[PDB]
Amino acid sequence: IPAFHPGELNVYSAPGDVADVSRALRLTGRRVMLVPTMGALHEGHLALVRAAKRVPGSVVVVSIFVNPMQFGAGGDLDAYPRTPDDDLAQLRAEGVEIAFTPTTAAMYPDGLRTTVQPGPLAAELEGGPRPTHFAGVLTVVLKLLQIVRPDRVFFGEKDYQQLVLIRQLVADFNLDVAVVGVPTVREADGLAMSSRNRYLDPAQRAAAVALSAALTAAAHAATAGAQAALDAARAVLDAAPGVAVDYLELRDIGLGPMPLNGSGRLLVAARLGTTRLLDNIAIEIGTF
Amino acid sequence: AIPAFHPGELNVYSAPGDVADVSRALRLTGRRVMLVPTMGALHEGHLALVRAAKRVPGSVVVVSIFVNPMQFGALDAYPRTPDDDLAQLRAEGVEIAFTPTTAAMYPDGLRTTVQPGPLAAELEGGPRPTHFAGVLTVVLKLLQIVRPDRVFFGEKDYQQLVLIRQLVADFNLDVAVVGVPTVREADGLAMSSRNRYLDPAQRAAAVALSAALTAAAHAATAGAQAALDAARAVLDAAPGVAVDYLELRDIGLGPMPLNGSGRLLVAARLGTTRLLDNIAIEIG
């Protein structure tokens, strides 16, 4: 079995090495926590890492893999930011003991053969412009969960639809893992942290505050009902320079075939130039 | 408090969480969990899977009995003999039977499912294009519920076996897949719950499938073409046997190599009953 140096960052690229080490750790009684990422780590990811680290007796595994299957054909895969050196430096500073950095060949030795087919939610919202996106996400997450076999897996609420779909995967395939959703980390003005924020020039960055301002205005207007909430958000978005809204939807919290009855989630997707930003917030209709 | 488990007796659990809990507890006690997935209506073919599982040192055998709606065509006619199935398992010394309801396996209906690779559209996938997605989806679920060290499948459903091996490799599953040789009647007919539907004329003609395959296996010293031609000749000597396919492939069901190990598969309809068989072939 590959060496593991306690209290230091151990980097493994072979799926078999991390599987062997994770198993050995679990057998000694350490609880394995998994934070799946595509690198280009920011404070939002660090919040996931810290949530994992606080679980008593845990050992944290952060996977970094820019999964080709979740990118739609075009230049998106090549355009994804890659900052490997900064990513590992941040994991070392956070006290993470395991980084799993597999190659494309090790993850997809047989190309796209057996894959995960998500439920109907994968075709909506983000699945509109990217129809095969979530099958890519669920397939890689299922594989990472089988490789690492964590007790808990951490995902951010920022990518809410993804989080809901991962909970569906876990329930539907009877996976023995706890899915932990971590609250969205935001800049001082409210902008949700994202690796795509680096593509906002100064003006677009100023204008981008409208997504969070619209959502938070809606959450408070919600005491007056769904129409008030949606219209408050639309007014903020309509007053924002250079913000092109793709969708603004208020749905039941499970985003499924259920109507909004009290508790919901308000989701927005907008483009600033070529940069597509997403944000979402909890909404409680009629609650002050 | 983990549910109760009585060593040496057949412990029947219908709730997924219960068998999940018991399997985990037994694994920690020094037992190796062996899973034998079935749809009930057990016969000697299934007992051979049970016996293969039981022989592993430290084994605790879990036989699942679940008529999976997802692998049926677009069900109620499927043989269901609960008390008798359990009686057979009891006689074999099986300690765990998992008998879930459809609602328990699919509490949210069909939502997230497994999409097989292209092999699922070939051979058996011709007539039943959604069949293997149903099989892999339920098998993945059973593997996650039970978390067995080894899972056993019969070679009679060879394409199913190959697809399960693809599922395990593709999803990085930590389970060993064990294929068990086909159990056959005295004249070679592969055992199947469908054999009883054959009338006398059909039952006599059905021997042609196995006879065609064994003839091919021996004709193979003369090449792939000789093997295929010998099998076709045997099938052609039988009345009322509508051959759906007779194909020679490599062991993973890809194209058959110039020479080496392969698998010959046949499927045919006798009246309204569809029969399948297959055999290892060594070319040359």
Curated annotation (Swiss-Prot), chain A:
ATP binds at residues 38-45, 156-159, 185, 193-196. It is found in: Cytoplasm. It comes from the Bacteria. Pathway: Cofactor biosynthesis; (R)-pantothenate biosynthesis; (R)-pantothenate from (R)-pantoate and beta-alanine: step 1/1. Beta-alanine binds at residue 70. The active site is at residue 45. Mg(2+) binds at residues 86-87, 90. One of its GO terms (molecular function) is manganese ion binding. SUPFAM superfamilies: Nucleotidylyl transferase. Its main location: cytoplasm. Transmembrane segments: none annotated. Keywords: Acetylation, ATP-binding, Cytoplasm, Ligase, Magnesium, Metal-binding, Nucleotide-binding, Pantothenate biosynthesis, Virulence. Subcutaneous immunization with the double panD and panC bacterial disruption mutant protects mice for over a year against subsequent virulent M.tuberculosis (strain Erdman) infections; mice show mild lung inflammation and fibrosis despite a chronic bacterila infection. This is a promising attenuated vaccine strain. Changing residue 42 to A: More than 1000-fold reduction in activity and 52-fold decrease in adenylate formation. The keyword Cytoplasm applies. Disruption phenotype: Simultaneous disruption of panD and panC gives a mutant unable to grow in the absence of panothenate. The double mutant has a highly attenuated disease response in BALB/c and SCID mice; immunocompromised BALB/c SCID mice survive on average 36 weeks as opposed to 5 weeks for mice infected with wild-type bacteria, while immunocompetent BALB/c mice survive indefinitely. In wild-type mice bacteria grow for 3 weeks then undergo a steady decline, bacteria persist over 8 months in SCID mice. GO terms for biological process: beta-alanine metabolic process; pantothenate biosynthetic process. One of its GO terms (cellular component) is cytosol. Changing residue 70 to A: More than 1000-fold reduction in activity and 45-fold decrease in adenylate formation. Its EC number is 6.3.2.1. It catalyses: (R)-pantoate + beta-alanine + ATP = (R)-pantothenate + AMP + diphosphate + H(+). Catalyzes the condensation of pantoate with beta-alanine in an ATP-dependent reaction via a pantoyl-adenylate intermediate. The reaction proceeds by a bi uni uni bi ping pong mechanism. Was identified as a high-confidence drug target. Belongs to the pantothenate synthetase family. This is Pantothenate synthetase. It comes from Mycobacterium tuberculosis (strain ATCC 25618 / H37Rv).
Swiss-Prot record, chain B:
Subcutaneous immunization with the double panD and panC bacterial disruption mutant protects mice for over a year against subsequent virulent M.tuberculosis (strain Erdman) infections; mice show mild lung inflammation and fibrosis despite a chronic bacterila infection. This is a promising attenuated vaccine strain. The keyword Protein transport does not apply. Disruption phenotype: Simultaneous disruption of panD and panC gives a mutant unable to grow in the absence of panothenate. The double mutant has a highly attenuated disease response in BALB/c and SCID mice; immunocompromised BALB/c SCID mice survive on average 36 weeks as opposed to 5 weeks for mice infected with wild-type bacteria, while immunocompetent BALB/c mice survive indefinitely. In wild-type mice bacteria grow for 3 weeks then undergo a steady decline, bacteria persist over 8 months in SCID mice. GO terms for cellular component: cytosol. Changing residue 43 to A: More than 1000-fold reduction in activity and 52-fold decrease in adenylate formation. Pathway: Cofactor biosynthesis; (R)-pantothenate biosynthesis; (R)-pantothenate from (R)-pantoate and beta-alanine: step 1/1. SUPFAM superfamilies: Nucleotidylyl transferase. It comes from the Bacteria. It is found in: Cytoplasm. The modification N-acetylthreonine is found at residue 1. Its EC number is 6.3.2.1. Beta-alanine binds at residue 71. It catalyses: (R)-pantoate + beta-alanine + ATP = (R)-pantothenate + AMP + diphosphate + H(+). The active site is at residue 46. Pantothenate exhibits uncompetitive inhibition toward both D-pantoate and ATP, and non-competitive inhibition toward beta-alanine. AMPCPP exhibits competitive inhibition toward ATP, uncompetitive inhibition toward beta-alanine, and non-competitive inhibition toward D-pantoate. The enzyme is most active in the presence of magnesium or manganese. Other divalent cations (cobalt, nickel, zinc) are less effective. Pfam families: Pantoate_ligase. Mg(2+) binds at residues 84-85, 88. InterPro entries: Pantoate_ligase, Pantoate_ligase_C, Rossmann-like_a/b/a_fold. Keywords: Acetylation, ATP-binding, Cytoplasm, Ligase, Magnesium, Metal-binding, Nucleotide-binding, Pantothenate biosynthesis, Virulence. It is an enzyme of class 6 (ligase). Belongs to the pantothenate synthetase family. PANTHER family: CYTIDYLATE KINASE/PANTOATE-BETA-ALANINE LIGASE (PTHR21299), PANTOATE--BETA-ALANINE LIGASE (PTHR21299:SF1). Catalyzes the condensation of pantoate with beta-alanine in an ATP-dependent reaction via a pantoyl-adenylate intermediate. This is Pantothenate synthetase. It comes from Mycobacterium tuberculosis (strain ATCC 25618 / H37Rv). The gene is panC.
